[PDB]
Enzyme design. Structure first.
Site, mmCIF file in Angstrom:
data_model
loop_
_atom_site.group_PDB
_atom_site.id
_atom_site.type_symbol
_atom_site.label_atom_id
_atom_site.label_comp_id
_atom_site.label_asym_id
_atom_site.label_seq_id
_atom_site.Cartn_x
_atom_site.Cartn_y
_atom_site.Cartn_z
ATOM 1 N N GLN A 1 0.822 -1.209 0.000
ATOM 2 C CA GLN A 1 0.000 0.000 0.000
ATOM 3 C C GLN A 1 0.857 1.260 0.000
ATOM 4 O O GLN A 1 0.556 2.231 -0.715
ATOM 5 C CB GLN A 1 -0.933 -0.011 1.212
ATOM 6 N N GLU B 1 -3.884 -7.398 -1.602
ATOM 7 C CA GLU B 1 -5.279 -7.087 -1.336
ATOM 8 C C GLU B 1 -5.838 -6.194 -2.431
ATOM 9 O O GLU B 1 -5.092 -5.476 -3.104
ATOM 10 C CB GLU B 1 -5.478 -6.376 0.013
ATOM 11 N N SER C 1 7.636 -0.309 1.573
ATOM 12 C CA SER C 1 8.072 -0.011 2.926
ATOM 13 C C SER C 1 8.740 -1.238 3.527
ATOM 14 O O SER C 1 8.643 -2.351 3.002
ATOM 15 C CB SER C 1 6.890 0.419 3.804
ATOM 16 N N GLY D 1 3.092 -6.682 5.612
ATOM 17 C CA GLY D 1 3.436 -8.019 5.155
ATOM 18 C C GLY D 1 3.730 -8.096 3.671
ATOM 19 O O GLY D 1 4.642 -8.814 3.250
ATOM 20 N N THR D 2 2.959 -7.367 2.858
ATOM 21 C CA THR D 2 3.196 -7.337 1.417
ATOM 22 C C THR D 2 4.578 -6.782 1.105
ATOM 23 O O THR D 2 5.424 -7.472 0.524
ATOM 24 C CB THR D 2 2.120 -6.498 0.724
ATOM 25 N N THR E 1 3.351 2.313 13.171
ATOM 26 C CA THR E 1 1.915 2.081 13.033
ATOM 27 C C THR E 1 1.526 0.615 13.197
ATOM 28 O O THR E 1 0.360 0.274 12.961
ATOM 29 C CB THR E 1 1.375 2.563 11.672
ATOM 30 N N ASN F 1 9.323 7.937 7.737
ATOM 31 C CA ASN F 1 8.100 8.735 7.711
ATOM 32 C C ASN F 1 8.209 9.970 8.596
ATOM 33 O O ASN F 1 7.827 11.073 8.185
ATOM 34 C CB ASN F 1 6.901 7.894 8.148
ATOM 35 N N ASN G 1 3.601 11.508 0.604
ATOM 36 C CA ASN G 1 4.199 10.757 -0.492
ATOM 37 C C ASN G 1 4.661 11.656 -1.631
ATOM 38 O O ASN G 1 5.460 11.219 -2.471
ATOM 39 C CB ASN G 1 3.194 9.729 -1.010
ATOM 40 N N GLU H 1 25.826 4.885 -12.646
ATOM 41 C CA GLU H 1 26.755 5.780 -11.971
ATOM 42 C C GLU H 1 26.391 5.953 -10.499
ATOM 43 O O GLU H 1 27.284 6.013 -9.643
ATOM 44 C CB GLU H 1 26.808 7.131 -12.687
HETATM 45 N N1 LIG Z 1 3.724 7.610 1.959
HETATM 46 C C1 LIG Z 1 2.962 6.645 2.480
HETATM 47 N N2 LIG Z 1 3.435 5.748 3.430
HETATM 48 C C2 LIG Z 1 2.613 4.781 3.927
HETATM 49 C C3 LIG Z 1 1.300 4.697 3.480
HETATM 50 N N3 LIG Z 1 0.687 3.675 4.107
HETATM 51 C C4 LIG Z 1 1.570 3.101 4.942
HETATM 52 N N4 LIG Z 1 2.760 3.768 4.855
HETATM 53 C C5 LIG Z 1 3.943 3.387 5.637
HETATM 54 O O1 LIG Z 1 4.099 1.988 5.499
HETATM 55 C C6 LIG Z 1 4.148 1.334 6.751
HETATM 56 C C7 LIG Z 1 3.390 0.009 6.695
HETATM 57 O O2 LIG Z 1 2.464 0.032 5.633
HETATM 58 P P1 LIG Z 1 2.599 -1.026 4.430
HETATM 59 O O3 LIG Z 1 4.014 -1.542 4.318
HETATM 60 O O4 LIG Z 1 2.155 -0.338 3.163
HETATM 61 O O5 LIG Z 1 1.575 -2.224 4.759
HETATM 62 P P2 LIG Z 1 1.042 -3.151 3.553
HETATM 63 O O6 LIG Z 1 1.934 -3.027 2.342
HETATM 64 O O7 LIG Z 1 -0.370 -2.760 3.197
HETATM 65 O O8 LIG Z 1 1.120 -4.666 4.099
HETATM 66 P P3 LIG Z 1 -0.088 -5.367 4.904
HETATM 67 O O9 LIG Z 1 -0.278 -4.700 6.247
HETATM 68 O O10 LIG Z 1 0.234 -6.828 5.116
HETATM 69 O O11 LIG Z 1 -1.362 -5.242 4.107
HETATM 70 C C8 LIG Z 1 3.542 2.293 7.755
HETATM 71 O O12 LIG Z 1 4.262 2.266 8.965
HETATM 72 C C9 LIG Z 1 3.655 3.653 7.105
HETATM 73 O O13 LIG Z 1 4.718 4.360 7.695
HETATM 74 C C10 LIG Z 1 0.828 5.586 2.537
HETATM 75 O O14 LIG Z 1 -0.332 5.510 2.141
HETATM 76 N N5 LIG Z 1 1.662 6.553 2.044
#
Ligand SMILES: Nc1nc2c(ncn2[C@@H]2O[C@H](COP(=O)(O)OP(=O)(O)OP(=O)(O)O)[C@@H](O)[C@H]2O)c(=O)[nH]1
Ligand SMILES: Nc1nc2c(ncn2[C@@H]2O[C@H](COP(=O)(O)OP(=O)(O)OP(=O)(O)O)[C@@H](O)[C@H]2O)c(=O)[nH]1
Ligand SMILES: Nc1nc2c(ncn2[C@@H]2O[C@H](COP(=O)(O)OP(=O)(O)O)[C@@H](O)[C@H]2O)c(=O)[nH]1
Ligand SMILES: Nc1nc2c(ncn2[C@@H]2O[C@H](COP(=O)(O)OP(=O)(O)O)[C@@H](O)[C@H]2O)c(=O)[nH]1
Lengths: 428, 93, 433, 436, 428
Positions: C11, C64, C133, C137-138, C172, C199, C221, C247
């Site tokens: 996400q 998802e 990130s 989990g993804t 989070t 973040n 973002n 480079e």
């Molecule tokens: N810039 C930005 N960062 C995000 C966003 N959503 C989550 N993050 C960062 O990503 C971290 C975890 O989110 P994700 O890695 O995206 O979680 P996910 O990929 O949906 O994996 P699952 O929880 O298994 O579904 C959080 O601690 C946030 O700091 C977003 O919408 N924009």
């Protein structure tokens, strides 16, 4: 008739030669479309040193352009005097050298080297009496270092009776535009020791020193920085391009400049250099031209020449002049600045005069110096190399691309074995 | 500018205007345009491909890079030699 | 000719991507659907096809729905190919096991098929931009599996990683210390170079240097989208010192293992501070190097820089950055490693930042600075201590194990990160011999 | 001058026939009534159409089907006017998923009629070029009648080219439990006489329409239409003018190395559903790669678990041949497409200058399509699956009484099993590399 | 007047010859409708080298078109120059080629041979001294290989002391447009080794290589690919048609480039080959014509001259150039690389200079090369034959039509016994 074949590698060298071909086209009166719209009749007499006759009137420079990144070719085609080369000599590549001497010498550079020697072979065979070749490159960085030295090695092993003029932008003490600059530089100068006949070391820090202290510029652009390099690169090749008393072509220079087969590194100079605000208060004569040639303000290498002794001085004056003063001013220089001239070459200057100066001026002078001050540049590159070689920094790239541990120490051994003679003949 | 591409109008997604009775997208209860473009209130057309989420050009559009080129080929590469022509006539003025 | 393929996973990476393509459409000139209302500039990150419906070289893959359904029902439903918007059916649930082991096999063949299709339509492939990130989990597991497969298949090509760091203070989720270590254990051996951004540092720069206390993630973002557009700029355009992706990965990666740069951006003014400041080159260089605009909350004073890549865009004369690099080298608090005297790589591009409707103001000069510091090891230890505390009595481990995890790989990743700590200390120690 | 006779046997064959003639109607200027509104200068209509006194243009085909209501669909629906009323060979009584009924009692009142029709259809042929037998390996008609018709046509016109377009039995679903009992017999009987036979698997057509066409619930009108495009792409060299024009004798000298191995597989290039063709580029390299992708194949067999023996590419539309040749070089140097060790040259090239014409429906109107036809060793797994299913069904003698009480002798299932044992042995024999 | 008849058999050679009549229609000056529309009487001087007169001056070519399938006949009839060919010598069959050598040679393809020889005999006496036999085909594939070589065999049995040249397209290493290139081609070469005097092996991949590297096309169609073949096939017979110095007929070419009776395979070449862009900046001279004549990119075979020692070279220059240079740089080629020319034949190069340039240029040069480089072509096609002969693959069609194992064994043995005399001379 006599010919010089111009070839260039790297983004830096491509811009070197773009400004050079603009300068030479303006000197020969050649328009961007390639024809002659000039003023002087004898100005067309020795066009066929850098240029090639073609059926109808647009002359084509005998230049081949090579770069692994296929964007610098786009830049030089989109440049002002871009529609002047043959489209066949745009020997580009579908890769990116990535500032890697390994990837410029032992990879796709060595896979494109066959094609670049093919077009170099074509342009060399389309001649009558070749003095040699002209390569422009940056000694720090990729492409022009690895491919450049490989290309020099193959051309030197192919045509051993022709001279090589490489105009190399050596890395500067002030800043570093590429982080592996001494890695590229030591490996490149390892090949430059036993290959070329005329290396010319140009420094960007020295270019800033000239354009801010002498030219009095505010926003120095690259067009200006290797406009100043194009000036000297035109000034060396003028005696075999225009008539005049006391001619001295490239080999006539190279016999007089280098005393030894390896000490062939020159630091160039141009010194009718007037700012646009102080040009109107000028009184152009031989004494202040020969005073401007001999200071550490028009010297294009970032080493003050008064840290070592001059081995050989050159002076390619251009312009309608008489020359008893051009002789006795070299007498005055050798007499006063005596602690920086050698004693074992008595009267170690060379003088040459060309009839026609560069346009927009009346009298110019090109300075080519061989000294014991390139000592400091080569030494500083040696400690700059040994700072990172001691802990294997930035070496996994070269080792993965195929380079060896022992040959790095071989290059540094040749580095120190060039450093030691320029010690011992500066201190007798 | 998707209507300027090809002269007949682009194939509009099935609005409320058509929605024939005795057909599978016959929803009852506030029927407006936007659910028929949102692809996942859209159950499929069931015999026809899935409804679009947009309006796409018509029946007579060619698909893909169709490079026509401008070279005359080898009849122009051998049957002509472009000897150097010039237009000096210099407007130096 | 110089193409580069972007895969957006998780996400976080997907919404970084929506900000990124929002930026790129305005940068090049194609309107949101994908056509250009009329050369070799778009043929880097975008392809060309029938009429003018340009399609980006992106694979939006996620386990998802509802993360990609926003794109499929948004205005950007026309930009992307309908099949490269790839959605799964079950959520990874912050489980590295459910992201790499159990629910990876229903999607990995499809995402590699689309990757090889996009690579088939690339005459020159430099590398990949992989957006995610170190959190969920993804972005923990599917990223790892993608990097394994891409390093196996395409071992001679560049894989650039854009990773969001799990913040040392706010966070989070409860198992980010598990997931970050579990993903970096496997991506360390495959990823060539991983630009990593936290973040809460973007949080800090938005609250201080952007003069707004309420921008949401669509603006969080956006700064990362600006960072990506700045970093892949000489590939898209022409400049004075063109810097290529090869480079970057040869001049920012000292040793085979130390490949985690920290990004930072020059001016982030917000349209009510533009006309009261000059924004010269020396001051924006000092602003990039001052110890508060770093996009990972680690103090650069407690460490030593190794190599930095400056990328100036807009009307920048080269000798202003020459003087700026000189001043930065003379300033004493920036401490370099003694074994690396050339600390800098300069790149200059003539094209200024595009002004998206938003908060970033129009500035004619902007440098992205990448640093390889040794203070990032403190952040690594900050994650390692959290992992040790949670792993002291097997917290949240049964959810991982029941989905296919092997217990010893936790400890294996643990002393792999301990080894990374000792590699950082070994590359940081000075000259005594 | 260059014409083929198309016989459509059984329900599957006649439904694929309805779809294909639906295609050729708008492929030519022949409106679906029979005439042509052209104000003419043609000679491309004569390959699959006749020429009557004014304009009617009856086609060269025969729909034979032992059960009515489907021939009655033909003679009740839209296309009755275009066909000869006596070309419609309907029978009186369905063969009922039974090779014994398709081959042993109820053929003898229709076989003479259909042979007579094929004969005097070939009378209106200066150069007849081949036979197009459309059927399945399933029901009683499409097994037994195509077996017996194949034997009689090989007796009467044996020197000629003989093509089968047949629906291969599904590996997972099927529609008859006597699918193995009928496929075993029809392939055992048509192996010795068929010159080559192209297979279609309904499961693979379902998956390719679900994935590429992105359609969730389309019917057999959309199953058979891809087969219609396949046959129109195959028999296009004899219709139009191109660059590498391929003959049916070239196809049969071409696609088989050995006399009995004569089962290549079809594949059709871009099958994009016109709601998607705007978003990609459909170039020569990617359509050639999409032929060899293990998802667009017209049957379920794994290409990686097998070796391609010889394959033929039919590019149709504005295709420059050297892009084809470059895509061939890239495919050859790709290491996941393994060939037999005794066949360096294995690729065929054909270019035709007439783009595909699409009926209003699923397929995108594309001016480029290549049909890939591969004789490969990957079908041995499907043959082994069908033979194992036949073994497990025959080992208990189930469903044999309907076969044997009809006139069929019981033991033919045995030698059919050793015939497929020989076929499996040959598919294993072609697989080893050279050691000698 | 010296006459020659031009038979075209197959799809490949049919299209090549069918557009060659177009390419020589421009040099002569007849339109599609047969009426002479030219500019000089000197082109009318020798119309009767390829063209037969017809009343009203409606000049008709002599060309027996033959194919087993009436599809390419319709292609030629509906092509650009369709209303030029005699209706009587459209000899075809209502049959299929089946790309089968046995079908073209020992089956119903031989049932049209009587009619084909009858219609060839129809123009065999409407003429004065029939010096040679043009025939265009492809060694790989059917019709042109099988029936083409049986046509060659029969017409040599009928006329024994006339030179015949076969412009034949050979398979490419890289790709394959036919699965039975080796089975057709080895059986086709089996008669050509002991029969013909002038083959011209013209592969398909080097035409695209020329169109990609030299001519710089982007969509090279079959007209563009066939046209270089047509230019060479026109330029080889120019001293037989138009005035010049050092004139040479086809038997002169046969004597000069056949050292030994079996080594008569020639590499074609045409070398004013320029791109549309570099055509601008090019400088047409006999020196660079020789340079791009001997450069291994303009030759039309996958036979490396740097891997093949040359035996005999011919150059039919066309144009008003002086003779001293077209002799001098031809000497300097051998003096430059004598190690790639044989020493047991000193003076191994032939110069002919026709007066008239090809229409659309100012001069040209057709290159003819008999080298040892065809040994790699023969070795590769022999290995392609052997790899599928090991498993007896693809053979049942041949055995059904009337082949056997011993004929293929004799063909492969003759291929090996042809590769030996083209390596044992390079081994001195
Ligand atoms: N810039 C930005 N960062 C995000 C966003 N959503 C989550 N993050 C960062 O990503 C971290 C975890 O989110 P994700 O890695 O995206 O979680 P996910 O990929 O949906 O994996 P699952 O929880 O298994 O579904 C959080 O601690 C946030 O700091 C977003 O919408 N924009
Ligand atoms: N294209 C197409 N194929 C069909 C259709 N109906 C059935 N099939 C195929 O035919 C198979 C079963 O029907 P058939 O084998 O053709 O039956 P038959 O040959 O007519 O013989 P009978 O059952 O006696 O009528 C199935 O497995 C399908 O694959 C159809 O409507 N269209
Ligand atoms: N003087 C001058 N220098 C230039 C110009 N263009 C580039 N440079 C210099 O080129 C150097 C870098 O070249 P390099 O990294 O080796 O390019 P590469 O050969 O493509 O790897 C920089 O230090 C610049 O000073 C120009 O137009 N004039
Ligand atoms: N130069 C050239 N080559 C061609 C042309 N047409 C076909 N070919 C080549 O001819 C080969 C096959 O032709 P072939 O099978 O002999 O046709 P056939 O005579 O009818 O059997 C292919 O490899 C093509 O590359 C053409 O128009 N020009």
């Amino acid at each position: 008739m006599r010919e010089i074949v111009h070839l260039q590698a790297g983004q830096c060298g491509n811009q070197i030669g773009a400004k050079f071909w603009e300068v030479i086209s303006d000197e020969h009166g050649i328009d961007p479309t390639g024809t002659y719209h000039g003023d002087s009749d004898l100005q067309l007499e020795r066009i066929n040193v850098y240029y090639n006759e073609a059926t109808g009137g647009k002359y084509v420079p005998r230049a081949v352009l090579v770069d692994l990144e296929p964007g610098t070719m786009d830049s030089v085609r989109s440049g002002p005097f871009g529609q002047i080369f043959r489209p066949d000599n745009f020997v580009f590549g579908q890769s990116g050298a990535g500032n890697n001497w390994a990837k410029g010498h032992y990879t796709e550079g060595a896979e494109l080297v066959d094609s670049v020697l093919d077009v170099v072979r074509k342009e060399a065979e389309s001649c009558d009496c070749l003095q040699g070749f002209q390569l422009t490159h940056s000694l720090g960085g990729g492409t022009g270092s690895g491919m450049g030295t490989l290309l020099i090695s193959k051309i030197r092993e192919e045509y051993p009776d022709r001279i090589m003029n490489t105009f190399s932008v050596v890395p500067s003490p002030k800043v570093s535009d590429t982080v592996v600059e001494p890695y590229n530089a030591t490996l490149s100068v390892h090949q430059l020791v036993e290959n070329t006949d005329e290396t010319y070391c140009i420094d960007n820090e020295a270019l800033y020193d000239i354009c801010f202290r002498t030219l009095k510029l505010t926003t120095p652009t690259y067009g200006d920085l290797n406009h100043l390099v194009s000036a000297t690169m035109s000034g060396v090749t003028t005696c075999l391009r225009f008539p005049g008393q006391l001619n001295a072509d490239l080999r006539k220079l190279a016999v007089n400049m280098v005393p030894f087969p390896r000490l062939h590194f020159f630091m160039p100079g141009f010194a009718p250099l007037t700012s646009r605000g102080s040009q109107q208060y000028r009184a152009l004569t031989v004494p202040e031209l020969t005073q401007q040639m001999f200071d550490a303000k028009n010297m294009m290498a970032a080493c003050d020449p008064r840290h070592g002794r001059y081995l050989t001085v050159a002076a390619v004056f251009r312009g309608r002049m008489s020359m008893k003063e051009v002789d006795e001013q070299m007498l005055n220089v050798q007499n006063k600045n005596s602690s920086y001239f050698v004693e074992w070459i008595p009267n170690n200057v060379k003088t040459a005069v060309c009839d026609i100066p560069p346009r927009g001026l009346k009298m110019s002078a090109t300075f080519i110096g061989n000294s014991t001050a390139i000592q400091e540049l080569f030494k500083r590159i040696s400690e700059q190399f040994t700072a990172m070689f001691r802990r294997k920094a930035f070496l996994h790239w070269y080792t993965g691309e195929g380079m060896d541990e022992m040959e790095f120490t071989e290059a540094e051994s040749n580095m120190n074995d060039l450093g030691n003679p320029v010690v011992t003949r500066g201190a007798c | 500018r998707t209507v300027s591409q090809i002269c007949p109008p682009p194939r509009r997604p099935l609005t409320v205007a058509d929605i024939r009775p005795g057909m599978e997208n016959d929803r009852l209860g506030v029927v407006r345009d936007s659910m028929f473009q949102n692809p996942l209130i859209v159950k499929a057309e069931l015999g026809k491909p899935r409804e679009r989420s947009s309006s796409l050009p018509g029946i007579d559009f060619n698909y893909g890079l169709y490079i026509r080129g401008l070279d005359g080929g080898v009849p122009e590469a051998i049957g002509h030699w472009n000897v150097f022509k010039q237009q000096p006539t210099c407007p130096h003025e | 000719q110089r193409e580069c393929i972007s895969v957006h996973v998780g996400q976080a990476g997907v919404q970084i991507g929506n900000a990124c393509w929002e930026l790129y459409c305005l940068e090049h000139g194609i309107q949101p659907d994908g056509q250009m209302p009329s050369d070799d500039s778009f043929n880097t990150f975008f392809s060309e096809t029938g009429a003018g419906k340009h399609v980006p070289r992106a694979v939006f893959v996620d386990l998802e729905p509802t993360v990609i359904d926003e794109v499929r029902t948004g205005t950007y439903r026309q930009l992307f190919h309908p099949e490269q918007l790839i959605t799964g059916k079950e959520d990874a649930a912050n489980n590295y096991a459910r992201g790499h082991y159990t629910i990876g096999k229903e999607l990995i063949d499809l995402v590699l098929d689309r990757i090889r299709k996009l690579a088939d339509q690339c005459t020159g492939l430099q590398g990949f931009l992989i957006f995610h990130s170190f959190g969920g989990g993804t972005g923990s597991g599917f990223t790892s599996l993608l990097m394994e497969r891409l390093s196996v298949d395409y071992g001679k090509k560049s894989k650039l990683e854009f990773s969001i760091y799990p913040a040392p203070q706010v966070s989070t989720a409860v198992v980010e210390p598990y997931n970050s270590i579990l993903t970096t254990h496997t991506t360390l051996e495959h990823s060539d170079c991983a630009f990593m951004v936290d973040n809460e540092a973007i949080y800090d720069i938005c609250r201080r240097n952007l003069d707004i206390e309420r921008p949401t993630y669509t603006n969080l973002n956006r700064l990362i989208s600006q960072i990506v557009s700045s970093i892949t700029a000489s590939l898209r355009f022409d400049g004075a010192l063109n810097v290529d992706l090869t480079e970057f990965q040869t001049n920012l990666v000292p040793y085979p293992r130390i490949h985690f740069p920290l990004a930072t951006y020059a001016p982030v003014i917000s349209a009510e501070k533009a006309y009261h400041e000059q924004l010269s080159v020396a001051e924006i260089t000092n602003a990039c190097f001052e110890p508060a605009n770093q996009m990972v909350k680690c103090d650069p004073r407690h460490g030593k820089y190794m190599a930095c890549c400056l990328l100036y865009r807009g009307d920048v004369v080269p000798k202003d950055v020459n003087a700026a690099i000189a001043a930065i080298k003379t300033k004493r608090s920036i401490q370099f490693v003694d074994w690396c005297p050339t600390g800098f790589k300069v790149g200059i591009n003539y094209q200024p930042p595009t002004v998206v409707p938003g908060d970033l103001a129009k500035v004619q000069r902007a440098v992205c600075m990448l640093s390889n510091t040794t203070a990032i090891a403190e952040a690594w230890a900050r994650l390692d201590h959290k992992f040790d505390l949670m792993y002291a009595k097997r917290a949240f481990v049964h959810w991982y194990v029941g989905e296919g995890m092997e217990e010893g790989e936790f400890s294996e990743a643990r002393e792999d990160m301990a080894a990374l700590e000792k590699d950082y200390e070994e590359v940081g120690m000075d000259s005594v011999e």
